[PDB]
């Protein structure tokens, strides 16, 4: 006889949301969505989409506030509660922050521009004032130094997801504890804080806030940061100190753009994945190598979530995929549909008729039981479009 | 020995004051900031003091042909081609604790940012700005109550000391250099803060807008403000106002109560107006009353008079004991150097009754102390032939 509203968007909504299918089948869900959830699968999943397909009833907070039996759990939701509205006080949200600090907006970039090494994803419960109610569980989160403002918000989102799953039990049988929020240390940033229309790089810094800069505002799905409307893809802090005006282009070739800052001379990387995509094709990796300037461009993907490693396979470009895979890449890649990189590769095993790879990727951690957002394993696709001996073969190479 | 220093402002004038005394054999040249008026303002002028002292003048041209000298920077304001003087001996204070907050406004940054600490910093001259290899450094506790100003002089006095304590080394080449890291470097241009422009911003913390206060709070420049109001620091109230941050809770004749983010604000109203005259009568009950924040108690008007100074002048004893036991500092001076000591000479002059004195010293007064024109209280009282003042605080001294 339960029930909870989800409010939110993307994967942290999504995944709360099929945990509690799963899991608690018996508890009644409603769930609420954003004013820019479009019901489109992007780099995030559209929550608006899981809930349609789902046949999970999409509200307003309007009604929200009239099921007295329901808790309330928000989850990156885009609408100020107003608690009064509620007749009761179980009321969660989940902050992607370790409260106090970064309370309200863009905690993604603010904590990598101030030169934080951690931040943190916090669940508390919800009052009149942004990001301030009692705290009830916190998670801290360690920001590499090479990851950038998506890297970040990725974490934040599975971090996200699991600590709801690790309390979602104490808050549905009013099992918790709260702890009332320090004020010291307490820290909040507006969307004033960031006008993303027109971003720019300050070169009147330090060449580690300079780096800083270009990890957080490096989230391509929005904007790379640019220079004279050049994109970058991060950079790097070298060992001299130019004389000249901080600001001042001090060398451009084809991969990248040196400037003066207030100490060390910084190089920007020319954004050059698109041209590495393409590449991957039918390229091999001594020449993708000569196209990297920094490392992580590899784990990069379009609007459509195509990787390099996803393009590698959907073209049986075997090497390349122990070379991207050896590097970092993840063997089981999806785009943003679900589809797997075990997908793409059947694609090209009908195609060319060369099976002969599988077994090797399969040794790397190849995964063919997974399945897209349509629930669909490759098996399925076979099956359906009658390849059954193509399905076999795959079948038996799996573990 | 040789020793080229290029700066402003009292640290420039201690240093050079201090060689003077304790190096006499040092020969001295200056370079001034270009903006250097020539006249005391709340900081001395170090052109001032190197024309009346006829301590050389030169320039940056002029500093690099002189090959046995060292090159001391005390906040001097230009860029200097490093390689090209014949040495190396090349050094500079810096009012942070490098490699964070390089740059401008370092009495400000730290306390807005919520820093615990800062420092400062001995280190060489070096390509980039404030980024040469670090030789000395002085940790600097940043108290909760402690504003712009309070930093500010904690920075001059420790630097002074700083510079004091290594002067042997920087002249024999005896220091040890480390160069600096570059993780956690921070740097603010003087296009961070517009200080012809300043307004608190209320989308914040409590936490963040008294760090605001505070770090906006230094009255020779400017005081915060709220509707035109000035406002000499504040307190985070327990409660939690409904209405948008920056709306008007309350407001009295003492104080402003405002909504934030999180915990409701009260912001005093500046009152050291009223205070300082008070100062010349009133006993400690009645002033402790006006007080909201204790440190109001050590502001100055814009001669350098604190309430300790106006007591003084005054004959005020009851209340310079209670400004004492405060933390004042009995031998407070003005913008002209004259000391409490001074004042209270002047006190007992009016008043013929000198039996006060004995409390003060006991409480720290020094009447050796000198002003800027190098006088003491003993030399004004020769000068005026009043002997038996002289006589009877002449008693005093052992
Ligand atoms: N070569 C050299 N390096 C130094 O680090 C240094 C010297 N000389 N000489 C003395 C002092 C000078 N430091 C500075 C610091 C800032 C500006 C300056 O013009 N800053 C501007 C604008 C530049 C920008 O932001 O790009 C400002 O932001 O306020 C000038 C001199 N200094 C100490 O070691
Ligand atoms: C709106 C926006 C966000 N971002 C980054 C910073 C944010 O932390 C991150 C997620 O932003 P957003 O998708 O607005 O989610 P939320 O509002 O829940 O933080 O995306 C950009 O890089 N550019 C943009 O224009
Ligand atoms: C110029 C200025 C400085 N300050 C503070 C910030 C600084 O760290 C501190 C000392 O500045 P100061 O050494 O006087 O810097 P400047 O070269 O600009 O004179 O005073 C103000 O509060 N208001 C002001 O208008
Ligand atoms: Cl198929
Ligand atoms: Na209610
Ligand atoms: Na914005
Ligand atoms: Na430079
Ligand atoms: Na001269
Ligand atoms: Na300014
Ligand atoms: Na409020």
Redesign the pocket.
């Given at each position: 006889h339960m029930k909870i509203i989800i409010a939110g968007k993307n994967d942290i909504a999504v995944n709360v949301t099929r945990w509690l299918q799963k899991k608690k089948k018996n508890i009644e869900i409603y769930a609420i969505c954003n004013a820019n959830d479009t019901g489109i699968d992007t780099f995030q999943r559209s929550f608006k989409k899981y809930c349609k397909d789902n046949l999970i009833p999409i509200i307003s907070l309007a009604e929200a506030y009239k099921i007295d039996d329901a808790i309330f759990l928000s989850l990156?939701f885009?609408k100020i509660v107003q608690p009064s509205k509620f007749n009761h006080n179980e009321l969660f949200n989940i902050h992607?922050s370790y409260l106090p600090k970064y309370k309200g907006?863009?905690?993604?970039?603010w904590p990598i521009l101030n030169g934080e090494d951690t931040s943190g994803v916090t669940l508390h419960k919800i009052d009149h004032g942004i990001d301030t109610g009692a705290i009830i569980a916190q998670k801290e989160i360690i920001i590499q130094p090479f990851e950038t403002?998506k890297d970040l918000?990725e974490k934040y989102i599975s971090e996200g997801t699991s600590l709801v799953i690790d309390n979602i039990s104490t808050l549905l049988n009013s099992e918790y504890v709260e702890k009332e929020q320090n004020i010291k240390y307490s820290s909040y940033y507006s969307k004033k804080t960031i006008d993303?229309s027109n971003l720019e790089l300050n070169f009147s810094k330090t060449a580690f806030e300079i780096i800083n800069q270009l990890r957080a505002?490096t989230?391509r799905e929005?904007?790379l940061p640019k220079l004279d409307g050049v994109n970058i893809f991060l950079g790097d802090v070298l060992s001299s100190r130019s004389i000249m005006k901080p600001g001042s282009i001090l060398e451009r070739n084809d991969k990248e753009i040196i400037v003066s800052t207030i100490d060390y001379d910084v190089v920007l990387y020319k954004d050059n994945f698109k041209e590495i995509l393409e590449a991957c094709k039918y390229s091999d990796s001594k020449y993708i190598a000569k196209l990297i300037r920094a490392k992580s461009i590899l784990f990069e993907k379009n609007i459509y979530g195509a990787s390099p490693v996803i393009v590698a396979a959907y073209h049986g470009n075997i090497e390349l995929i122990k070379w991207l895979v050896s590097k970092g890449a993840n063997i089981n890649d999806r785009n943003y549909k679900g589809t797997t990189v075990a997908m793409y590769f059947k694609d090209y095993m009908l195609k060319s008729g060369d099976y002969s790879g599988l077994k090797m990727l399969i040794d790397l951690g190849l995964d063919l039981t997974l399945t897209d957002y349509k629930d669909y394993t490759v098996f399925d696709y076979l099956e359906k479009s009658g390849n059954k001996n193509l399905l076999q073969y795959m079948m038996a190479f799996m573990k």
């Amino acid at each position: 006889h339960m029930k909870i509203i989800i409010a939110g968007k993307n994967d942290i909504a999504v995944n709360v949301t099929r945990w509690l299918q799963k899991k608690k089948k018996n508890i009644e869900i409603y769930a609420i969505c954003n004013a820019n959830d479009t019901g489109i699968d992007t780099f995030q999943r559209s929550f608006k989409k899981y809930c349609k397909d789902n046949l999970i009833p999409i509200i307003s907070l309007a009604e929200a506030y009239k099921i007295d039996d329901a808790i309330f759990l928000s989850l990156e939701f885009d609408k100020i509660v107003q608690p009064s509205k509620f007749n009761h006080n179980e009321l969660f949200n989940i902050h992607f922050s370790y409260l106090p600090k970064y309370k309200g907006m863009y905690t993604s970039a603010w904590p990598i521009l101030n030169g934080e090494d951690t931040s943190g994803v916090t669940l508390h419960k919800i009052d009149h004032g942004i990001d301030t109610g009692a705290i009830i569980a916190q998670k801290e989160i360690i920001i590499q130094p090479f990851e950038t403002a998506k890297d970040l918000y990725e974490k934040y989102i599975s971090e996200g997801t699991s600590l709801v799953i690790d309390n979602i039990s104490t808050l549905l049988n009013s099992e918790y504890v709260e702890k009332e929020q320090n004020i010291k240390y307490s820290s909040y940033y507006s969307k004033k804080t960031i006008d993303y229309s027109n971003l720019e790089l300050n070169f009147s810094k330090t060449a580690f806030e300079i780096i800083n800069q270009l990890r957080a505002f490096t989230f391509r799905e929005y904007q790379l940061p640019k220079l004279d409307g050049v994109n970058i893809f991060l950079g790097d802090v070298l060992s001299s100190r130019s004389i000249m005006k901080p600001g001042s282009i001090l060398e451009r070739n084809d991969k990248e753009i040196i400037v003066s800052t207030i100490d060390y001379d910084v190089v920007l990387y020319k954004d050059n994945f698109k041209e590495i995509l393409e590449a991957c094709k039918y390229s091999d990796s001594k020449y993708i190598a000569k196209l990297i300037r920094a490392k992580s461009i590899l784990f990069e993907k379009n609007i459509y979530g195509a990787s390099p490693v996803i393009v590698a396979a959907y073209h049986g470009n075997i090497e390349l995929i122990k070379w991207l895979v050896s590097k970092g890449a993840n063997i089981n890649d999806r785009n943003y549909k679900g589809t797997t990189v075990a997908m793409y590769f059947k694609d090209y095993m009908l195609k060319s008729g060369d099976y002969s790879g599988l077994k090797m990727l399969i040794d790397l951690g190849l995964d063919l039981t997974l399945t897209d957002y349509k629930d669909y394993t490759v098996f399925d696709y076979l099956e359906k479009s009658g390849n059954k001996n193509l399905l076999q073969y795959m079948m038996a190479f799996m573990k």
